[PDB]
Amino acid sequence: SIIDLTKLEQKVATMWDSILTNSPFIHEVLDGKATKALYAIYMTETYHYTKHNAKNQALVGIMGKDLPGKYLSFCFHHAHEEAGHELMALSDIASIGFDREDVLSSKPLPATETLIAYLYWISATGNPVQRLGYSYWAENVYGYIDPVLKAIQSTLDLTPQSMKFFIAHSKIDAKHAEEVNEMLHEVCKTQEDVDSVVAVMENSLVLTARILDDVWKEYQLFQSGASDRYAF
Template sequence: MDGEIKRAWGEIHAGPFWRHLLDKGLDRELYRIFMAQLWHYTQHNPINQSFAAWRVPPAKMGLLRYCFEHAEEELGHEKMIEHDLRAVDLLDDTLDAPALPATTALIGYLYSVGLRDGAIARLGYSYWAENAYPYITDLLEHMRTDLGLADREMSFFVAHAEIDAKHSKEVKEQIERWAGTPDEQQAVLTVARTSLWLTGQLFDASLHAYQARG
């Protein structure tokens, strides 16, 4: 699965958002739009993680415990985005605008995974999301150099990295324990591929919204 995730990130890095980032850098407006999209979808993660538990039989107590504990740990992470936007005077009405269609698609897909496919399949999303930091170093570097952000103004990414290091180990353990059949393993891989592709669409839609400003 690591190879599939690496390839998917390669496609994201070849896309419009990443090319713009490397060629022209990151300004405050693009940062504001992108962070707003992260805020929209992040606040749904603890809910759709909880939804994924409904198809888990009571006998799989360890998987149920993982679903609920992980959902609780994800609760309120969007507040870190609010903090970071506020720290650079970009909060204002930034979060009042509706999510972009690509962001809405990602949100809806993760709910559908929880309700239709269940907790084992959703581990595919968690697997790459908890291991994303090696693939976003360019973005973090431009946040520091182009916008002059310090770690205290990047709490969503910096503090999140410490949280995700713990979660990454837990997700791997859950996949090894519960994704025992070929169908379950394929479901994990499918969700990983699809959710990461949709995240790439979120990146690119943020750039398109930035470029479409009047």
């Protein structure tokens, strides 16, 4: 294999370190000061972008030219596996006493809309291998964010029922992680293939981090600033 996954693992570990050290959202949570409203604001944006993942994954298989047989199957298989996953986030929001309808009628925050656009773009154009970079960190993510999830669970005294989105991830994503890694070794033939994977891995994570910044800004404005939300 031409791809060195220890090198990608190293870049991902460096990026999370920065995100967790600099995000006020993450510090607020780890201090033990997360609230229902904060968790909802954040789960709402997760719902918004997650809603498009099956679709943009399937798009690689439609737009990609001369993909290896295994890669075309992979795209449709995983699109099928991801379909509806956003409902788990919407279920978690309902589990903490909020209205599913307020979420369904909401427009995504600008950072989230920006991530959504990026993911369709890199799925519809360029080196068809590149979306695997998103999947690479997206699937081996539980190992870095576990302390943040454990702190939210403690502060809001949540049960696995109000945390289904992150409970699916750490069970059948230890398999999906293995599947992504095997697919990466199969489809990466040149260094240009690897470079495109690294470029998408990096930017998709940079863009996902900006969502935390939008979530935090709207959370602060939430007390007075804007009529954007409903506290019950």
